[PDB]
Amino acid sequence: CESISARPGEVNGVMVSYVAWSAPLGGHGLTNKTTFEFENVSVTEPLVNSAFERTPFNTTLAGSLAALFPNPEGEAVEYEILELYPPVNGIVELGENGAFTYRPATSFTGIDRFWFSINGNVGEFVIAVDPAQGPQIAQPPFTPAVYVPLSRREVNKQTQALRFVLGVSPAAKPADIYRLNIRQAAIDCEGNEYFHISCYDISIGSCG
Amino acid sequence: CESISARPGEVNGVMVSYVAWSAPLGGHGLTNKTTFEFENVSVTEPLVNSAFERTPFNTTLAGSLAALFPNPEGEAVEYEILELYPPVNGIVELGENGAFTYRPATSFTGIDRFWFSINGNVGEFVIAVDPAQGPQIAQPPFTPAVYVPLSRREVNKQTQALRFVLGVSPAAKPADIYRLNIRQAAIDCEGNEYFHISCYDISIGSCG
Amino acid sequence: CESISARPGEVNGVMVSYVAWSAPLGGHGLTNKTTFEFENVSVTEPLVNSAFERTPFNTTLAGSLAALFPNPEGEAVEYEILELYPPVNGIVELGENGAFTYRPATSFTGIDRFWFSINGNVGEFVIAVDPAQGPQIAQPPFTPAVYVPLSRREVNKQTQALRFVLGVSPAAKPADIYRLNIRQAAIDCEGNEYFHISCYDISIGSCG
Amino acid sequence: CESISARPGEVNGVMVSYVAWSAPLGGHGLTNKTTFEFENVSVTEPLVNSAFERTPFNTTLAGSLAALFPNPEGEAVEYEILELYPPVNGIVELGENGAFTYRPATSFTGIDRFWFSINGNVGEFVIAVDPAQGPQIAQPPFTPAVYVPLSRREVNKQTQALRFVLGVSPAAKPADIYRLNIRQAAIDCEGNEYFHISCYDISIGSCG
Amino acid sequence: CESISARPGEVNGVMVSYVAWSAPLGGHGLTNKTTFEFENVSVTEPLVNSAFERTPFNTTLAGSLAALFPNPEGEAVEYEILELYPPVNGIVELGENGAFTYRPATSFTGIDRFWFSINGNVGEFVIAVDPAQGPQIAQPPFTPAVYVPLSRREVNKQTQALRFVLGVSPAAKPADIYRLNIRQAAIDCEGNEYFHISCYDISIGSCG
């Protein structure tokens, strides 16, 4: 179980070499049939809830963050906006008691995000801007704690190597650990398949 | 948390190299999407209040510094003007008991500043000189203790380096500490975005 | 039962090393998730009572300390304010025969404290500055004799060490003794847990 | 309780090192947030009274010291002026049987002092010179027996050391004892504070 | 705080090199925007008063030095003229008991100076010779203890150095100390400013 270290919000690349395994088999070597699987070993349940909302074309959106924190006690609450992760196609504004305003850019249509903090807990809020005319936009899934975009993958068949992108969401909590499984395929000279399995441990770090 | 040292009234430049990180990813490298965030780890509340005031075109301005020091005691007071920070487009005169006079230069129109000291506490005072004809000039925001002018920023794509300007206001109190977060982006050959996060500690020094 | 000596008004911090226990288990080691409990062995009940009050925005407050000393016996009394622990957002003035006046700083809103002494005993007084507009602020709990801030706690995975902060209120009486229990969790390579239990005795000291 | 020996009329200064306490805590070290308190253990009440008076601009002053010695017995008296501590902005002349005259320097305004002796006891006399064409100057407080100027204080972050300036008034009676308490603050890497308390006993010395 | 040694009556040059600071920033480097400030740390108040007087064209002037020494207590006095500092456009003559005569040269019009010593205390006396026809000549300010003529200043942009002239008045008293603050500006390649701050201590000395 090879070890990897990641920091919340960072996005990094990973490379693995397969020459030692594919070379003696002969033939073409690797093939584009990689499969990824994620498993939890130590994950801390989040204490806040993500949310999704819609708005029509060129309309300011308003809402509240109060309903997204289901604390069991009437303890003091203070809200905040993570400035390192500003929305791409809009501007957010934080009021008081969790009230906020979103101001979409002119002629924009799509999905936008911003991250909020409540008593140190982090969560995701997704906004979809409907077009002026046409059907509603589908709700997209929330971003996992750690993910690998399956479309963003390649194999350098000229030297039997594999590269992919590893992404950590800002919501990941430090000291948690995740496991990744990779099953890779290869083809002999006669045109028949082989396989290989390996795993990696990802542990969330921090600064210092 | 890399450490930086700064002195009140100084403006200095900082450079950070990214070759070690973006070199193996390939492609163009840095993509000019930096974002900055400031945090307070140990800041002392100011004991004086800044102020903003207006004057008509070619009109001498008169005011008082007494109202800007809300001490809760009848302790003795004394007013002074920091000569190292003279106004750019005018001349200031200090009277008795905090009475001061500002004499704008001929045909000047804009924002001008000067810094004053009350019983050892530093503060900012802003003056806006209205034009002869036209609408009023907007009130600008006050000068933070430490700031990075975001209009000034560049990335040397030929060598994967970033440069910015770090400026400390004269009002910064020594022995305080501030934290700066930087999030930088890069694009590989296939268009996958990568991100990098770092932080620096800024502590206020002094002479000796 | 390891022995710890603490002084009133102190905040010290403690570190415990688990390498002798967690290293041979293999796996990943410590996994955060600790629990603390406090038990009494010898405690002397206070002879004075704490109190709480509210004041409107920018409104001076007044009161008397005489009602907080339920002495059944008949003896003379004298009052005093502990100047070593001054309030952070106001100024107090001890009056005649238990009278006092609290003058909040301009524009303040929140909670404030100051510690008073009656005939050699010690107690707490809590004052709340209500905001000018909006809902009122809830009552906070009184500070225990000894407490462990749960947010100031970390585990180092490189050396398998735990750090936490121990603080003693000024009201703690010398020669008292408390007991602290710690339960630390560690995990194997697959996510299953181990547990370790230890306890410490805390005795209140003094100067010399 | 470390022991300090001080002589009347002296100003010495002290230095204490906190490396042995704050070094293992990591973090940022000291914070420059000390607090000082004085307590009596053995103090002898003075047998003479201090006084305060006012005088117009460039106007000579006269008075008598006889009223400042409330001796309930009947004994002979004699007066003296301590020349080791002369006034800084005037001249004094001891008259007949407690009479004296103060002749301020031309164009002076402010506060001035001189220390007198009656039958071996010591006291203070404060004289104020009002401005010619302005509001009267406020009465200043008398100098305590021992004091610590709170503006002449600093912490050296390079070696974790604190400096303050201890001073003794000429009127301190030998063989007296005072106790000084100090509470010092240090911060971790995130801004949370640690606290430390210590005390010292100051005993008034003499010549030999 | 770099140290500088100065002697009364001396005028000397000072040079400071900025190549180590402005070189890495690029662009033009230094700019003509230097600002100077002088602060007192240990100054002895003068015991004599300067004076200023005027005379018409080609008329001998007579005066007295007696009124310029307001000694409070009567004591023997003696007057002298410092011959190392002769007037430029006239000749003086010292009589008895402070009586002196000034005899301007023919066709001279302007300001002339000479320095006098009363019982060991040094002073300045300024004479203005009015023209035959025209308005009166304005009274110029007195000579400070230490001064820097701001007109005489240059920056060697070809090698990034700054030169200025430091002059010591004959009236300066040994063992005194003054502090000088210098703020110098610089401009980057893109055309935006940087600043640098430094200070020096000037102590009056002598020779033996």
From TrEMBL, chains A, B, C, D, E:
Protein name, as recorded: Structural protein
